[PDB]
Design a binder for this molecule. Structure first.
Ligand SMILES: CCCCCCCCCCCCCCCCCC(=O)OC[C@H](CO[C@@H]1O[C@H](CO[C@H]2O[C@H](CO)[C@H](O)[C@H](O)[C@H]2O)[C@H](O)[C@H](O)[C@H]1O)OC(=O)CCCCCCCCCCCCCCCCC
Ligand code: CLA
Ligand code: CLA
Ligand code: CLA
Ligand code: CLA
Ligand code: CLA
Ligand code: CLA
Ligand code: CLA
Ligand SMILES: CC1=C(C#C/C(C)=C/C=C/C(C)=C/C=C/C=C(C)/C=C/C=C(C)/C=C/[C@@]23O[C@]2(C)C[C@@H](O)CC3(C)C)C(C)(C)C[C@H](O)C1
Ligand SMILES: CC1=C(/C=C/C(C)=C/C=C/C(C)=C/C=C/C=C(C)/C=C/C=C(C)/C=C/C2=C(C)CCCC2(C)C)C(C)(C)CCC1
Ligand SMILES: CC1=C(C/C=C(\C)CCC[C@H](C)CCC[C@H](C)CCCC(C)C)C(=O)c2ccccc2C1=O
Lengths: 49, 79, 130, 86, 665
């Protein structure tokens, strides 16, 4: 995958990969529920997305 | 010629070349004969310089040595 | 007159060509006849090989060639990842619109030397927090 | 070989002898000075020419002098190791 | 702990540290020795505990100095810079946090950078660094300056305190396992993780907003938002021409995790081949051994930094800021060379002061084969250039080594990035372009290898033959820094490791000058420049791609690089921007020539001249009781080396910076 072979994509480099995150079929749910209605000074947790 | 000089290109200076060589084979041969004489004499001179003076000559060499009268007069006059 | 007759007559300061103008005219005729502007070296040695977009002509790296180097020998370089530029513009415009809607007012240029109150400060605003 | 000479200004402090790297020098009895001894140079054939004796000499100008002689270089004075002239 | 023993009484003694300076000021050699041995804490009066005290406290004091310098940089950026104009429009405005006075007409130095600002264009990349860090406000820069000054004060206090906190029982500096574990897990692992956190939480939103075009205070005060699935480095920010800062933050998180994992496996003893390194562990527990190893490590890291800061773009707009990238590369390459020769020096010092490793017992084969490889490399590599010169002069280009003629293809120089075909551009400039290697690159790379090997030869010979040799068998008794052993044994000039460094510095400077010229010319000819219009662009490079055609001959280097590209610096007098660079060019030439004085002459001539001069002073009753003396032999060598390197570096500095500034503006 370096000189004789030109690997264009992350999937080419590592089989089964299609993005920055590993190809795990598990959607990691939030460990704790979030407030449906927010409040001033909340700073909701960021999403790796 | 392919001149490379600014002044040469500007003023059109030229290197004229004759139609015939200046000297002939016989002339070059004569000059080489003179040069060969020079070379033989120079080899002899180099040998003489290498070996320097030989003060032993008075022991075996023919003759009894000689000083020119002018050389004697110079010696008498001194330095 | 002409170079042919000028050189046929020739130049001699000692006898007839006592005129510096005639002397240099003959010199110019001889120059034009017997001198060349350039040695005539092959133009190929002057053309670039690397960075001119004509690298593939020389076949320097034929075994396992580098893909990033364009294959075309015309001397032109394509822009890498052309397709993304419209996509990037669309993404940035979408983000601009999203943040505009989220704030609810037009974006205001920040002041390098300006001072802005914190949005959560407990005291009355002195300068708008935005 | 070099020439190591000693002059009567010598006071017999032995510093030259102690600084000798190849033991060229030795103190010998004398009456010229108060110390009653003067450095000598018997083994001048081993002198390499480092002038450490000269460095260690106290006198106003050196009572020991090393004269270098590049024309008479020997293997001992050159410190030859890989090649042998003996 | 007892601070009653720190008094200013010793400040006026001027030589208390060295016992050899007790007979104060009988000559000027005393002054010179005072300065030379000021920081040689090993040979100074005291004990090993005091040596450790001084080493650590001096390290902290230097830390405070660096923090002060960084705080000054931040202050200049905040108050004496056009960072605001640069941030809003980086391309139009050149970075400048440097302003000169109008004393003697010196205001001419300031050049047009923006409508309201005039000054000197900076080339350190500090503006790009601030932009990457997310600093977009004068208040932020001011608080960074305040933090740097507070750190300076803290480090100064720490040095002063540790000069007495550490006693003769102190041993925390000998706990190598603890030191290495702490540095690997906290300083590196936790540091990288924390900086990834900083990037994610501060720089990523600010940088994304800046790329979009948003400059709203509320926004300035969702990771992977814009980054596609494309491999990092294979796709640069189209609006910034640099690797995505989210990719950089992920990199730092991964690096911190890897460092923590390495530290934890070392803690658990998972690494097993301790015996292979146990010999080095026992041998190299020395100040100079550690200093040499660290200097070599940082030299190599500086060289890798020089290469990567340019080849791999990570700072915003630094790719198109051609003076910045060039200056960064050149500066870090020079630091690499200097720290490598330093590593050689302190390896020699460690060998002198401690027992060497067993590879010194077959030193003759090592240095012999290194000598042979140096000779063969130099012969082939430079004689290819000489062959090209001679044949081209004779008029036989078909006989030279070039792409059109006999060609030396670099078969092993193979790609690994696997980039897509084409080049990356950003607002009329080539941010990224593949470098195509040919005969010229082959020849120049082998020249690089030759010079590196000769410098290594000098350093290794100095290290291995430090204790003794066939010539002199008591070099250990002679010490580390002595001029010679005498005129004997043919002459023992410059047999000391100090002199071996004195020559290795010349050779390192030669190597680095060739490296700088190669990088400069190759980048100008084949990478940098503008473009003129699936679309195909014809790329107009600054040097017009003449490296591949002219670099094959030394005459080509002399003409197309030095003479041709010295037009900017040589003709810089009238221009307000670079007149200082032209003057520095001239003055550096002067200093370099002046160094030859000390490099060629000798002590005795100057001592005799000084005595003849002093005759007149004594005649007129001007009797200096600090008797004037000519500089020692080693000092003369050091002065010559310093002036030589400084002059050469100054000439190169002014030449390259003038060229870049004029070309980009
Ligand atoms: C961050 C980097 C942190 C480095 C690691 C810190 C280690 C923590 C030290 C623990 C506290 C300490 O041991 O605490 C004690 C420390 C060390 O004290 C030591 O205290 C010792 C105590 O001794 C006594 O100790 C025993 C006490 O029981 C016995 O009595 C024993 O006999 C006796 O010797 C000795 O006195 C030592 O001489 C003395 O050094 O106290 C001191 O002196 C305090 C020193 C604090 C210096 C802080 C400098 C900060 C300056 C910032 C300035 C910014 C200002 C803003 C300016 C803006 C304007 C521009
Ligand atoms: C030492 C480094 C460091 C520091 C000081 C912080 C600091 C912070 N992070 Mg974290 N963070 C870090 C590394 C770090 N992070 C790294 C490496 C990543 C990338 C994987 C993140 C990704 C991240 C996200 C996505 C979020 C935070 C959030 C937070 C906040 C507190 C989180 C907390 O205590 O959860 C404690 C939880 C447990 C102990 C379980 C705070 C701003 C949250 C925040 O600020 O939301 C607005 C948030 O949502 N961080
Ligand atoms: C790396 C450290 C560093 C360096 C190289 C410089 C260099 C410079 N600073 Mg300084 N500066 C620094 C740190 C540094 N600064 C720090 C830490 C601060 C505060 C955080 C400042 C604050 C500062 C200000 C406010 C100003 C400068 C200015 C200057 C310039 C002129 C200095 C002068 O006229 O001195 C004069 C000579 C002396 C003071 C003599 C020094 C020795 C005697 C004994 C005192 C010069 C380029 C001036 C400038 O750029 O004007 C256009 C200017 O106005 N600097
Ligand atoms: C009074 C003279 C003076 C002063 C006080 C400063 C001060 C500063 N300059 Mg410099 N500068 C000067 C003259 C001066 N400059 C001149 C004449 C020029 C040419 C126009 C420049 C061009 C310049 C640029 C382009 C940059 C600076 C920067 C800086 C900062 C760097 C910190 C520093 O110096 O670390 C200490 C560093 C050293 C002691 C370096 C020593 C080794 C150098 C690199 C060798 C190179 C050759 C040398 C200059 C000349 C040798 C020959 C000579 C003896 C005849 C600081 C504010 C940088 C910055 O970020 O500013 C905010 C920056 O980017 N300066
Ligand atoms: C390279 C940075 C560095 C290192 C390795 C150390 C190492 C040490 N410091 Mg610290 N120290 C530093 C910077 C550093 N210091 C700075 C910058 C300051 C100035 C604020 C201090 C001020 C300081 C004090 C006042 C004391 C230490 C002490 C110590 C010891 C650690 C015990 C401790 O409290 O650990 C926890 C952290 C050890 C000798 C203490 C010591 O030696 O106690 C016996 C101690 O009293 N240090
Ligand atoms: C807790 C974390 C921590 C941190 C952040 C540091 C940071 C540092 N330590 Mg370390 N150190 C630590 C723990 C830590 N230490 C511990 C627990 C110990 C055992 C007591 C030590 C013992 C120790 C010693 C003995 C020394 C350091 C030194 C240093 C400095 C070396 C930097 C350098 O040479 O870069 C090199 C970068 C370039 C060349 C560029 C650096 C500031 C050295 C120093 O000079 O400190 C002032 C030093 O000699 N540290
Ligand atoms: C989260 C994962 C991650 C990410 C996103 C990055 C991202 C980056 N790394 Mg990498 N890196 C990582 C993990 C990661 N790293 C780890 C775990 C290590 C080991 C400690 C390193 C060690 C490392 C070094 C030593 C260097 C980088 C560099 C880089 C930069 C350029 C790399 C490039 O163009 O590769 C091109 C991509 C490929 C060739 C595809 C192959 C990918 C794998 C092997 C499959 C980029 C910011 C370089 C840098 O900072 O340049 C300025 C650099 O010198 N990284
Ligand atoms: C004399 C020592 C020497 C040194 C210091 C270098 C240095 C370099 N070469 Mg190499 N090179 C050498 C000899 C050397 N070369 C020889 C003899 C040849 C054959 C003509 C080459 C052919 C060559 C090419 C084609 C390329 C390099 C390249 C490089 C770079 C390293 C990367 C690489 O691919 O290396 C490869 C290194 C080799 C192929 C040489 C292998 C090591 C030696 C020769 C083994 C000999 C030992 C043998 C078993 C016993 C000999 C006994 C003796 C009595 C005969 C670097 C500039 C590359 C580069 O960056 O170019 C721009 C590149 O493309 N070299
Ligand atoms: C030996 C002997 C005896 C005898 C005898 C006899 C009869 C001997 C006769 C000998 C004879 C008849 C010998 C001629 C030589 C001619 C020469 C060398 C000519 C050279 C001419 C030269 C080198 C000229 C050269 C050139 O200048 C030329 C021409 C042209 C120029 O461009 C330049 C050059 C350099 C090219 C005795 C007396 C009977 C008894 C005794 O007991 C023993
Ligand atoms: C200056 C300069 C530079 C740079 C440098 C740097 C930048 C470095 C880095 C630095 C850094 C950046 C560092 C870092 C650090 C960090 C740290 C050291 C951290 C730590 C952490 C910790 C300590 C933790 C703590 C904690 C908490 C948070 C609480 C609780 C828990 C715990 C305990 C864990 C160089 C080299 C180029 C040289 C030249 C100039
Ligand atoms: C010149 C020279 C001297 C004589 C040089 C001496 C004594 C140096 C003079 C030192 C002065 C007094 C230091 C003060 C600094 C300068 C006078 C500063 C000038 C700055 C200008 C900008 C005005 C040696 O002693 C010597 C020794 C060994 C090898 C080479 C040499 C050598 O080359």
């Amino acid at each position: 995958c370096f000189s004789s072979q030109t690997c264009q994509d992350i999937g080419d480099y590592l089989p089964g990969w299609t993005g920055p995150l590993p190809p795990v079929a598990y959607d990691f749910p939030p460990l704790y529920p979030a407030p449906e209605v927010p409040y001033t000074g909340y700073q909701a947790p960021l999403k790796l997305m | 010629r392919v001149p490379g000089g600014k002044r040469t290109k500007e003023l059109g200076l030229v290197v004229p070349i004759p139609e015939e060589d200046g000297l002939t084979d016989g002339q070059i041969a004569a000059l080489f004969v003179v040069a060969l004489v020079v070379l033989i004499a120079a080899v002899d001179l180099a040998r003489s310089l290498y070996f320097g003076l030989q003060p032993n000559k008075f022991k075996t060499a023919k003759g009894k040595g000689s000083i020119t009268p002018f050389m004697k007069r110079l010696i008498e006059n001194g330095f | 007159p002409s170079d042919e007759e000028i050189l046929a007559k020739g130049c001699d300061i000692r006898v007839d060509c006592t005129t510096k103008e005639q002397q240099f005219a003959w010199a110019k005729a001889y120059y034009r006849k017997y001198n060349q502007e350039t040695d005539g070296k092959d133009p190929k040695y002057s053309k670039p090989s690397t960075g001119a977009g004509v690298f593939r002509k020389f076949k320097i790296d034929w075994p396992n060639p580098d893909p990033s180097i364009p294959d075309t020998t015309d001397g032109t370089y394509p822009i890498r990842n052309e397709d993304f530029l419209p996509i990037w513009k669309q993404q940035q415009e979408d983000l601009r619109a999203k943040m505009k809607e989220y704030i609810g007012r037009e974006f205001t240029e920040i002041r390098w030397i300006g001072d802005y109150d914190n949005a959560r400060s407990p005291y009355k605003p002195h300068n708008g927090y935005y | 070989s070099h020439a190591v000479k000693i002059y009567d200004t010598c006071i017999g402090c032995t510093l030259c002898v102690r600084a000798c790297p190849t033991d060229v020098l030795e103190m010998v009895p004398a009456t010229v000075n108060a110390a009653k001894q003067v450095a000598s140079s018997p083994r001048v054939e081993d002198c390499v020419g480092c002038k450490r004796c000269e460095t260690a000499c106290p006198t106003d100008f050196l009572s020991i002098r090393v004269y270098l002689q590049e024309n008479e270089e020997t293997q001992y004075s050159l410190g030859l190791d890989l090649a042998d002239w003996s | 702990a007892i601070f009653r023993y720190v008094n200013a009484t010793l400040w006026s003694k001027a030589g208390h540290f060295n016992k050899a300076l007790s007979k104060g000021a009988k000559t000027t050699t005393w002054i010179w020795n005072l300065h030379a041995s000021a920081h040689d804490f090993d040979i100074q009066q005291g004990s090993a505990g005091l040596i450790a005290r001084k080493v650590f406290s001096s390290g902290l004091a230097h830390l405070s100095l660096v923090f002060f310098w960084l705080g000054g940089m931040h202050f200049h950026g905040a108050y004496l810079s056009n960072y605001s104009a640069w941030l809003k429009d980086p391309k139009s405005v050149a970075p400048s946090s440097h302003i000169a006075y109008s004393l003697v007409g010196q205001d001419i130095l300031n050049s047009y950078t923006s409508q309201y600002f005039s000054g000197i264009t900076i080339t350190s990349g500090f503006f790009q660094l601030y932009r990457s860090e997310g600093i977009v406000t004068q208040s932020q820069l001011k608080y960074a300056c305040a933090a740097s000054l507070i750190a300076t004060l803290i480090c100064l206090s720490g040095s002063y305190l540790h000069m007495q906190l550490m006693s003769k029982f102190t041993s925390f500096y000998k706990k190598f396992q603890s030191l290495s574990q702490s540095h690997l897990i906290i300083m590196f692992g936790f540091g990288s993780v924390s900086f990834s956190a900083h990037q994610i939480h501060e720089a990523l939103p600010i940088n994304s907003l800046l790329d979009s075009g948003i400059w709203d205070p509320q926004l300035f005060s969702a990771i992977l938002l814009g980054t596609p699935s494309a491999i990092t480095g294979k796709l640069l920010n189209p609006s910034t021409g640099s690797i995505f800062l989210s990719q950089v933050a992920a990199h730092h998180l991964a690096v911190g995790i890897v460092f923590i994992t390495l530290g934890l496996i070392k803690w658990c003893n998972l690494f097993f081949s301790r015996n292979a390194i146990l010999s080095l562990r026992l041998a190299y527990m020395d100040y100079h051994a550690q200093l040499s190893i660290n200097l070599a490590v940082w030299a190599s890291l500086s060289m890798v930094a020089a290469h990567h800061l340019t080849e791999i773009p990570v700072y915003p707009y630094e790719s198109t800021d051609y003076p910045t990238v060039l200056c960064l590369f050149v500066h870090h390459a020079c630091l690499s060379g200097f720290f490598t020769v330093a590593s050689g020096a302190h390896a020699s010092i460690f060998v002198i002061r401690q027992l060497p490793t067993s590879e010194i017992r077959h030193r003759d084969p090592i240095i012999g084969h290194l000598i042979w490889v140096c000779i063969a490399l130099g012969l082939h590599s430079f004689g290819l250039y000489c062959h090209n010169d001679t044949l081209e002069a004779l008029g036989r280009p078909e006989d030279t080594f070039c792409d059109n003629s006999i060609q030396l293809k670099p078969i092993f120089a193979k790609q690994f990035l696997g980039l897509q075909p084409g080049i990356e551009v950003l607002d009329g400039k080539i941010v990224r372009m593949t470098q195509e290697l040919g005969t010229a690159d082959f020849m120049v790379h082998h020249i690089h290898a030759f010079t590196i090997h000769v410098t290594l030869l000098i350093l290794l010979k100095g290290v291995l033959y430090a204790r003794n040799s066939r010539l002199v068998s008591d070099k250990l008794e002679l010490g580390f820094a002595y001029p010679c052993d005498g005129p004997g044994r043919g002459g023992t000039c410059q047999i000391s490791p100090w002199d071996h460094l004195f020559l290795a510095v010349f050779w390192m400077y030669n190597c680095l000058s060739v490296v700088i010229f190669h990088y400069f010319w190759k980048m100008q000819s084949d990478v940098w420049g503008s473009y003129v219009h699936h679309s195909s662009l014809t790329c107009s490079h600054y040097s017009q791609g003449d490296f591949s055609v002219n670099s094959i001959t030394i005459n080509g280097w002399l003409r197309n690089l030095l003479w041709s590209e010295a037009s900017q610096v040589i003709q810089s007098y009238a221009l307000p921007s670079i007149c200082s660079y032209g003057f520095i060019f001239l003055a550096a030439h002067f200093v370099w020539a002046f160094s030859l004085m000390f490099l060629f002459s000798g002590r005795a001539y100057w001592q005799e001249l000084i005595e003849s001069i002093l005759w007149s002073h004594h005649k007129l009753k001007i009797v200096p009781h600090i008797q004037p003396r000519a500089l020692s032999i080693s000092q003369g060598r050091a002065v010559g080396l310093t002036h030589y390197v400084l002059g050469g570096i100054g000439c190169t500095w002014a030449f390259i910076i003038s060229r870049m500034l004029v070309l980009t503006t």
